[PDB]
């Protein structure tokens, strides 16, 4: 699986890939950062209740029409056009079409570009539109191309998959254990806040993480003892692999310097 | 506790003890993992309020009868049969009867197998059934035979008994101290949320762990000062032996690799 | 290490000071631990509303009389008698009269022994009885003579006085800063939960410690930004000197080994 | 330690700059510390509802008039006069006038002195006075001249600007991600507590920091899963650069000793 070998990539790839190459490259990087931030702000702003009241045709969050009256649609279209231009230039300057599914920073652009085109295509089994609108948030991840800190975070997450899986596994074990314990310790009352073990999962996760919401809490003596143990075990279980993940992050962090 | 090695049970012990020995061993390990997960899911699902609201057939969550119409009973019986087969094969290949109370990974199977048979026997004071049903959750601990991370967690807990006991001791000391302080600082009011020191134990544990529920909180100036000190001392007391436990976990974790 | 030096109290000092010296010494240590625990449980139990509701017989929690009908008074008197006997023996074996400000493990006994006698004398202005009954809780600290862990905790606290003071100083700085910020950011509304900066002190301490109660929370945009900064700065400020205190504890902990 | 250049600056500068130089210098340092604390207490006390309710007379908290009847105005005027005297003496005795815009310990005095004079000038929109009163709290930062711990904290903050920025960046990324996820997972109900993504920003910050308020919480299954992930990712994101900041603090802390 060799590279395309077009011999056409070099100039545009250097212009749009290395911000330090030239002054125009730095200008392009700054413009890209501002466009990403503008798209993020617009995405967060379309959800405000000021605009939701006057809105198949509603799950999209924007009105696609020839007139293009919605300012949010205008901003989203401009940002999507810029992202499309960037991706097309880089891909026509990207030799390794085979390694396209290996680089995360290009499938990130794919993810940031796909939702608009799916919504346009489907305008011309129902939760699909909501799922796409949710996936559209991953345009936040496109800032990783411009920030080395997010790249180090990505490398840390890649290197700490085993420790992250262990953290999730220990959380699952403790959540099941303490949810069962608190459900059975607070089962013989009508005022209990734990109708079921899956309903106690939420309380268990909230207590182990030591977040603490108060939406559901133990009321019995045994339930309170179980909650005490839940808090202690949550502290311990979280503290076990977090130092390993932190050491990975520090190694990848001071490696660049 | 190794296998007898009589040259007759050797094949069965190799199949049911070393998943990496052969392809069928890996299949058996995967089937065991799926059966354990199925049992956990079924156990968590019988408690859903779909069935409890329409209330020995009630405290157990499953109806033992000739017809055997309950699907949850069918799933539990299948999982218990598989666990019974596994334990019987391994014990028939396990010589060391003297170390019956020493091995944890086989008394775990005993614990996962016992509640079903006690409930069957006792179907033919009253909190015994609830205690048995609560103990039945420990089939979650049976996943430790297949995951090395849970084995490392068990080794860490065994190696950090003194530090864990010190953590619990410091928690008890601080809880008594701050429960007394907040009870006495918030005693001369009709709206106090601390009827007694044992009732302030819950608030103390919640504050020292920094979970934070809001179900009971100080309302006086002295009570708020006491709660401030409670939060600070809880952070400090938890942070004292957790690094020792974490160092133990990291040692046992990087020991395997 | 040296003897009491009285030339007479050597045998009693060996019996009552070194639990490992002989079997009777271990018996005395176990009896002392049980008596301390019994006193702690009785102190925590006199405050239960089962007994307090029948309403100095209420400010003190025990009725001092010739009949001595109250079981709590009987238990407290027995524990105080045992503590008095221990203190009399050890003080008859304690040389340093002028060292009133230095030794802690004997002024702990002084604190555990005063409240009963001072309340008996003062029975014969009003907050004195409540303050004494609060001080009576420090009998929990008398367990430090029997536990090496609490002794190591005391040595850590003595060695980390500067770092603990820095922690309290940073907490005070951040609490003042964020209390002022959240009071001024949430001042122009009728439903604000921060009537004053000292009233915002409680919210600041709760947020910096990341305990989280919800009794008072920001409701404005600026108040929510201030609370965000408060949580971040609380995490950072707590995390600054806690590692130093933890290193002190670990040094004093592994020193015994 | 540069030359005075005036033939007059040296003596006053040594008196008002080095507390350990002489007894009067230590007296001046103690008086300055007491004056700073008195000003802080007065500032925190003017906001109490006892005084604010019975009232340009409300935005400032003090009435500037010839009579000067307000005790809070008297205390603030005395503290401002002392700060003015200190700053004028030090500036008259300060050789390096060039580094005034770079030195932080003198612009801190400028910030502590400016609000009083601006309010006096403006007495002789409306949010300007409130902003000035809020800025007036930075007199808390003037204690850094007298405490070496706050100086070490300042050096740590200056040395850990990149890591602090990374912490804020990761917090922003996670907050946007989880706010969008929880808004979309809890959108199709009448009782949703997340009207918009910016309204979910508060919940995200509260959950990632593990503070936990309960003012808004997920109610759906998907919302609860999103909140679980939010708590886990908040723990991880906070734990990534905090050890680097703590190492910076420890380096600057043991450097002095």
Author numbering:
A (entry chain B), B (entry chain A), C (entry chain D), D (entry chain C): 138 to 192, 206 to 274, 289 to 421
Paper text:
Among the most-studied ion channel proteins is the Kv1 family of tetrameric, six-transmembrane-segment, voltage-gated potassium (Kv) channels. We present near-atomic-resolution cryo-EM structures of the mammalian voltage-gated potassium channel Kv1.2 in open, C-type inactivated, toxin-blocked and sodium-bound states at 3.2 Å, 2.5 Å, 3.2 Å, and 2.9Å. As observed in other Kv1 and Kv2 structures, the voltage-sensing domains (VSDs) contain the membrane-spanning S1–S4 helixes while the S5, S6, pore helix and selectivity filter P-loop form the ion-conduction pore in a domain-swapped configuration. The selectivity filter of potassium channels consists of an array of four copies of the extended loop (the P-loop) formed by a highly conserved sequence, in this case TTVGYGD.
We obtained the structure of Kv1.2s in a nominally zero K+ solution, with potassium replaced with sodium in all buffers from affinity purification to size-exclusion chromatography. We were surprised to find that it is little changed from the K+ bound structure, with an essentially identical selectivity filter conformation. Like Kv1.2s in the usual potassium solution, the major density peaks are seen in the IS1 and IS3 ion binding sites, with somewhat lower occupancy of IS2 and IS4. Unfortunately, Na+ and K+ ions cannot be distinguished in the density maps, and we therefore cannot rule out the possibility that peaks in the selectivity filter region might come from contaminating K+ ions. Second, a structure of Kv1.2 in Na+ solution does not show collapse or destabilization of the selectivity filter, but instead shows an intact selectivity filter with ion density in each binding site. The Kv1.2 structure reported here with Na+ replacing essentially all K+ in the solution shows a selectivity filter conformation that is little changed from the K+ structure. Ion densities are seen in the ion-binding sites, and the occupancies of the sites are altered, but the limited resolution precludes an analysis of the coordination of ions. We conclude that the Kv1.2s selectivity filter is stable in low K+ solutions, and that the channel most likely conducts Na+ in the absence of potassium; both of these features have been observed in the NaK2K channel, where the electron density profile in the selectivity filter in Na+ is little changed when K+ is added in a small amount—1 mM—that produces partial K+ occupancy.
